[PDB]
Design a protein around this ligand. Structure first.
Ligand code: CL
Ligand code: CL
Ligand code: CL
Ligand code: MG
Length: 470
């Protein structure tokens, strides 16, 4: 029937799975890393609606998992329980703002209409749940039912640390808050927790027991509509970044004039802020660069990462520039860039169909890391921009919605926005949150309205700023 192991698998697949459909690239569209040639898409032109409370349904399952532990290793699974709770609620609050925390399980069980905690309270509870998760794993033994990190306590301690530092960096606008102690807790975890040691520590989904990358040919007919953005192609060309050749394939209209696949000029970025009819004309005449073949014709594609070694190092770099920790910003930054380049190389065959004549070799990595154009200058805003831009580029097809969250938090990289095409109700910007699910005004109206009055003066609005963004 139902064992702790089987439930663990369920929860873990939930956190790491992707859809084999268009929705996979909705966050790439929001972050402006690509346009979509099939039709005018909401997430390309910045139209938000409501998000969901589906995440809370995992609470009952996590509790059953812990109650069901049949050996003496309850701390392992309880550690997982606390990690999954924090993670799921973290992402819901990132989407929407205040929501239930204290009363969430009671609400799921139908015992109450659950009060909404303030987002500050939510973030504090998330951080306390992660400290508990770290202490639980620390006093636990390896466990069964984990296909992502193999039930390895050492790996779970690193995943918990990694998420702790990600959550704390997302609280950067709240560095002054008296009670949240963001800088202080970030430094303490860096000194006392378990930092990742390599790309082997990534919490990710790898493809190809009998399962293919979400945009393989066998899973979708729609990957062909992807049009890589100027935000990738122009940044790559400007810095001689050979990752362009692994992200993209040549524009067919360039190949037809005799421009070769190894040439930088064969690749065309599409500005996703242009009127859709212009985008459609560029798509029909093949004046655009689509996905590299590794995403679409290569069964294992690349792992889809939630928590990674490169990522953690871009977080450490930003913390260093912000003065949260004492280490050298530039060294973290270059570790991060190197880690992403090695990640690509490790997960891509050395064949022309994938690298187009520019293989990622150790010499290419070493050369790129010392490119003058990407060096940190020691001017704070310029350095945060560089770290966030390299992080943006390294997170194409990765870390669902995180790029957009870092954009909200820092304003980087600056995205293409066109008043005459932007379909948000404010022309000049992206929306800053989703609305709450309709089910909350159907069954928990009073508590939801208290929260809407407190946060926004009463209206559930996509252009209002949640607390962590104020
Ligand atoms: Cl480990
Ligand atoms: Cl349009
Ligand atoms: Cl994103
Ligand atoms: Mg995506």
């Amino acid at each position: 029937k139902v064992t702790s192991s089987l439930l663990a698998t369920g929860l873990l697949l939930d956190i790491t799975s992707s859809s084999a459909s268009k929705s996979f690239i909705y966050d790439e569209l929001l972050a402006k890393q690509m346009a979509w040639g099939e039709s005018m898409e909401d997430y390309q032109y910045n139209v938000f609606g409501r998000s969901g409370f589906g995440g809370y349904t995992t609470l009952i399952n996590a509790q059953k998992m812990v109650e069901s532990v049949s050996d003496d290793n309850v701390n392992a699974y309880d550690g997982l329980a606390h990690f999954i709770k924090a993670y799921k609620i973290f992402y819901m609050s990132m989407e929407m703002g205040d929501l239930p925390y204290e009363e969430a399980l009671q609400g799921e069980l139908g015992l109450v209409r659950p009060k909404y905690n303030t987002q500050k309270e939510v973030m504090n509870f998330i951080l306390s749940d992660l400290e508990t998760a770290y202490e639980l794993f620390s006093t636990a033994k390896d466990f069964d039912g984990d296909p992502i990190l193999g039930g390895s306590i050492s790996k779970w301690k690193k995943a918990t640390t990694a998420f702790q530092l990600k959550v704390l960096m997302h609280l950067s606008k709240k560095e002054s808050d008296a009670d949240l102690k963001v800088k202080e807790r970030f430094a303490r975890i860096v000194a006392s927790g378990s930092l990742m040691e390599s790309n082997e520590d990534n919490l990710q989904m790898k493809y190809a027991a009998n399962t293919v990358y979400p945009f393989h040919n066998t899973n979708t007919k729609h990957a062909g509509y992807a049009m890589l953005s100027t935000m990738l192609i122009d940044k790559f060309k400007a810095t001689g970044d050979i990752r362009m050749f692994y992200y993209a394939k040549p524009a067919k209209a360039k190949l037809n004039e005799g421009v070769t696949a190894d040439s930088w000029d064969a690749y065309i970025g599409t500005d996703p802020s242009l009127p859709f009819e212009q985008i459609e004309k560029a798509y029909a005449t093949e004046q655009y660069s689509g996905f590299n073949a590794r995403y679409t014709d290569y069964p294992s594609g690349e792992p889809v990462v939630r928590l990674g070694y490169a990522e953690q190092n871009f977080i450490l770099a930003e913390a260093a520039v912000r003065g949260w920790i004492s280490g050298d910003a530039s060294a973290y930054y270059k570790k991060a860039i190197r880690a992403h380049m090695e990640f690509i190389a490790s997960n891509t065959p050395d064949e022309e169909v994938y690298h187009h004549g520019h293989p990622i070799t150790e010499e290419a990595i070493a050369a790129f890391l010392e490119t003058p154009a990407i060096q940190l200058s020691g001017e704070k805003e310029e350095d945060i921009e560089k770290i966030l831009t390299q992080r943006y580029l390294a997170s194409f097809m990765q870390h669902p919605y995180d790029v957009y969250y870092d954009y909200r938090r820092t304003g980087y990289p600056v995205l293409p926005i066109n008043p005459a095409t932007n379909r948000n109700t404010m022309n000049d910007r992206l929306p800053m949150r989703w609305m709450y699910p309709k089910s909350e005004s159907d069954y928990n109206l009073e508590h939801q309205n208290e929260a809407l009055e407190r946060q926004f003066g009463g209206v559930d609005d996509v252009n209002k700023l949640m607390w962590i963004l104020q």
